[PDB]
Write a protein that binds this ligand. Structure first.
Ligand SMILES: CCCCCCCCCCC(CCCCCCCCCC)(CO[C@@H]1O[C@H](CO)[C@@H](O[C@H]2O[C@H](CO)[C@@H](O)[C@H](O)[C@H]2O)[C@H](O)[C@@H]1O)CO[C@@H]1O[C@H](CO)[C@@H](O[C@H]2O[C@H](CO)[C@@H](O)[C@H](O)[C@H]2O)[C@H](O)[C@H]1O
Lengths: 34, 246, 246, 246, 246, 218, 45
């Protein structure tokens, strides 16, 4: 298949997104307690 | 039920669970209620919406084909067709009728009935091929149910991550809530990919493999019956039909 | 082994390991037990569920077709069929039997046997094309095992990483080691993608390439035996067969 | 070198490099040695494992077809066929043997030789079409090397990225200076996708386009040779052959 | 510019720009120099590498076929052929020459010339069909340039997005300069998808629609010319030719 | 999350724009009839009024068909009525099949052309959904001042993607499918009329017409 | 398959969004406003 790379790339990006959306969320929470 | 599937399920369970427990997991940590309900409940819902109810009753029959043990009978039917062709060379066609009257293979029996009636050779091919393509279509319809379940299950994983992302953006009062919320994202992803890839797409692939074996047996019987109509000698019939078997 | 596969494995190891060491690392940091067991174990499980057991016994023969050296004996046979042409022309068809009895190519031997038995040209074409179709189907079935192993392997990498990350979500409280922990989890995806792309899909592609070479040689033997039955002259026989050899 | 390819490569470099620089990045940020080695080294490895050695030596010839300057001689040949046809009609076919001996087009030469030797029209068509089919197959094999290189190159970009993230997330003890580190990892993905899309799949596409042009020249020499055998009047031959030329 | 394309472009601009301005926005936002250079520069590069230079000169002529008004004269000729059918009846076929001596349609003018010369039916069919096949091949080649540009354009968008992600991660350490760079990602997506699905992939579809209309007109002139050779009575001709007109 | 104004004007507006650029205006004006066939009554009556045609088989050959032309003035259907006029003195077997057979090909092409408008619309619509979403996200990149909207604003942007995917799958592809399926049924009824006209030339066996016609009915 | 090449693009856009949201949250109100306003100019008026 030509476009077999996108399957893995969409999986890696998704994992990365979860990491920042988790950090962002922590940054607001820390700023609230500070 | 079937040996290759049984060893595959043993190897799959040992690989995934053994990998988790070797790096210090606990098996209760993989179970989550809401993740199970989104991925499995959502897959079941998507199948029931997408297909008419009579197709769902074929799902039982689909599994019955997929895990059918290996049947050696093609060898026996080759011998039968060669013997019948030898009678057709030596003897009146009525001897075929009386020999095949009570034969267990319906498709072969009907082919011979058409040659005894002296029906036209392109018509005999046509009516036999119409039965072959009808059988091919039935097996394809079973496989398509499992391929669709394999497509829906990963999309329910995406919905699970969306629910996880909403909870973590929406509601924190202490950082401890982080883990119990983002858990839903990861565990729903795991069930989506793991259920699709091990259960659903393998069962689809195995249905298509077993269908191709059964269709080859039908094609061999068709070439046997047309050889009997042409009146070929037994050694040449033996050679042609043997090409279909491996 | 094939020289191209040996050079390819040397280039592949130098690219991947040399790249990792150049940006900075240790090779001992790129090895994980649990990640290998999840990725390879999961791939093996999905393949065993996907196919009947008899297909998996063909898997040995699949590798033998891919890695075998190119014997390249086609030229020898092109001469023989030309020589048979000359024998058939002077001596008559009975001499073809005595010429062919001890030929190391079975497909050629059977083709000539059909011509000396005097079978009509559409029949000898039909039987020989059924042998070619059977060999095409056999080689495709070997390749499909490796193509399907290459499609499960990356997704098993994803199952591996998500299992790693679920364990880490239990230690989010320590911010210092979260970073190193995530790296180890990613190792599985590196295996999933790397094994699929270097090992599994290349073995499939090499099977299909070598199958095509062998099918051409079979098709030449088909035009060779039909040409000697027609009674073409040696110059015309040589010209037709030459279209196949590169 | 071919002018459309040269202007396309200039535009491709300006798009990628100019696109990066115009928003205030650096060529030293863009040019990464380890990412180049993993993507290009990995692609070379996967193609070498994927094909027998003899096909890789065809790569030189493949590029030579892709960039062949189109100094069209097709028009020149149409004259040759038409004038040859009127000689065949007036003088008798023996004149073609005297005429067509020095001719640089081997396919036309062999076509005429078959008509001079008095061979039957269906045999002439069969042999000539086998030579067309052989050339079509040869050009497809060249294209397939570049299409397969374009498939592996993006996946090697993923390997280079995930290996980059392993190194960076490994030596992170806290969330400082992570952004620049992760950025460089993505350069390997950029080389994978950008090289595949601009260089590899275009050169595959161009090989297939120029193949089709060359096959139409052969198919015309086929209608030229068959019309020379039939002995049609020159005006009618000129009409048919012109339908092929643009 | 055909009326459908003019209304379609007005609807396209009003939908996209009107949507943005209505929810609140400024149109100066949707122009991004760097995004245009990546998406359009990259698409131009990929198309120029993919095709020989002579094809690109045809691209103008492709647009002329897409947007020419429908001044169809099919109805006119449905009369012309029927007339000429009567003249062939109440006069010699030699008379046909003067009636077709000059006609706007070359296809019709020639077809009749081959019947005047007295050529046989299967050869006149073959020469006419070769002209139809040449016209169909020409129109397919125009469409293929537009389809190919539509394929590369979204992939250039994803290259631009990866360049956006690289630049935005580069600025994490000092988050004070991300305004321009943030857009280059979003606007490169927008140009990729919007250009492909509103400009290129439509203009391809219109070229294929209008080629099919012209080919059907030629197929009529073929059936008309063969009927004129056969010498059918006018009512039969008029019935047949009309089945082509809608 | 209802009728987002901007989403509709970008998914439906853009789909209409892409279809109008894609097809000449003469094709676009046929959309009316496409809907008519896609939503129309089962109308299998001809399949069951085959007996009406078979009544003709014996009767037409029993006595002169000279009255047949006035007799078939009633429209069982045009193809049938027109065919009888040809089957009347003046047509060789191959030509009468050929002229009638061509009508069948012309009607098959006509129905396929209707379906292709809906198939292509269902191919542009999902992509336009994406254009809507990206413009939504660009507008959020503007108003980044507040920290709560960062939730709901992204959600509404995705409504534009849903209006696409949903419109394509439910409205457009079912209308295409129902046009093409009922076209295939109507073509079979044509083939029935063709076998009727050919058998009217061939003989005068009412039961034998029954046998041939029955094969086409299924 | 257009979906994959799009759902790949669309998911990448979201990551770029949050990478920006995280970085801004590590900044004070003063520099926040300059960036927050600066952007707010190009995509609103
Ligand atoms: C590619 C993605 C991989 C990257 C690696 C992953 C994370 C990388 C590091 C990010 C991160 C951990 C991640 C947390 C969730 C995200 C999980 C993602 C993984 C998902 C699978 C660590 O970041 C820490 O917090 C700040 C972040 O910069 C920073 O603060 C300093 O520098 C500023 C500079 O501007 C400057 O203002 C100033 O000098 C400081 O404010 C610290 O120096 C830094 O160490 C987030 O920080 C969080 O900080 C919390 C308070 O400590 C901490 O709370 C826990 O511990 C508390 C005391 O221990 C305790 O009181 C809490 O009760 C407990 O709850 C969290 O647990 C978490 O640690």
């Amino acid at each position: 298949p030509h476009d077999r790379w996108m399957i893995t790339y969409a999986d890696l990006i998704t994992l990365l997104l979860i990491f920042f959306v988790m950090m962002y969320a922590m940054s607001r929470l820390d700023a609230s307690k500070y | 039920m079937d040996i290759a599937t049984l060893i595959g399920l043993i190897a799959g369970a040992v690989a995934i669970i053994g990998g988790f427990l070797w790096e210090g997991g606990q098996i209760t940590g993989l179970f989550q209620g809401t993740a199970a309900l989104i991925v499995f409940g959502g897959t079941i819902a998507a199948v029931l919406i997408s297909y008419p109810m009579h197709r769902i009753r074929t799902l039982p029959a689909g599994i019955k084909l997929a895990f059918k043990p290996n049947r050696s009978e093609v060898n026996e039917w080759l011998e039968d067709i060669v013997e019948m062709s030898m009678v057709a060379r030596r003897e009146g066609v009525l001897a075929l009728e009386q020999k095949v009257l009570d034969h267990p293979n319906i498709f072969l029996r009907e082919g011979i009935q058409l040659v005894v009636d002296g029906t036209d050779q392109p018509i005999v091919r046509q009516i036999m091929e119409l039965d072959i393509d009808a059988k091919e279509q039935e097996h394809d319809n079973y496989a398509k149910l499992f391929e669709s379940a394999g497509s829906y299950a990963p999309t329910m994983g995406i919905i699970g991550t969306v629910m996880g992302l909403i909870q973590v953006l929406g509601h924190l009062t202490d950082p401890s809530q982080l883990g119990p919320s983002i858990a839903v994202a990861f565990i729903a992803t795991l069930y989506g990919v793991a259920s699709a890839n091990l259960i659903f797409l393998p069962i689809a692939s195995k249905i298509r493999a077993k269908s191709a074996e059964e269709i080859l047996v039908m094609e061999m019987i068709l070439e046997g019956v047309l050889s009997v109509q042409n009146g070929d000698n037994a050694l040449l019939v033996r050679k042609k039909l043997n090409t279909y078997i491996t």
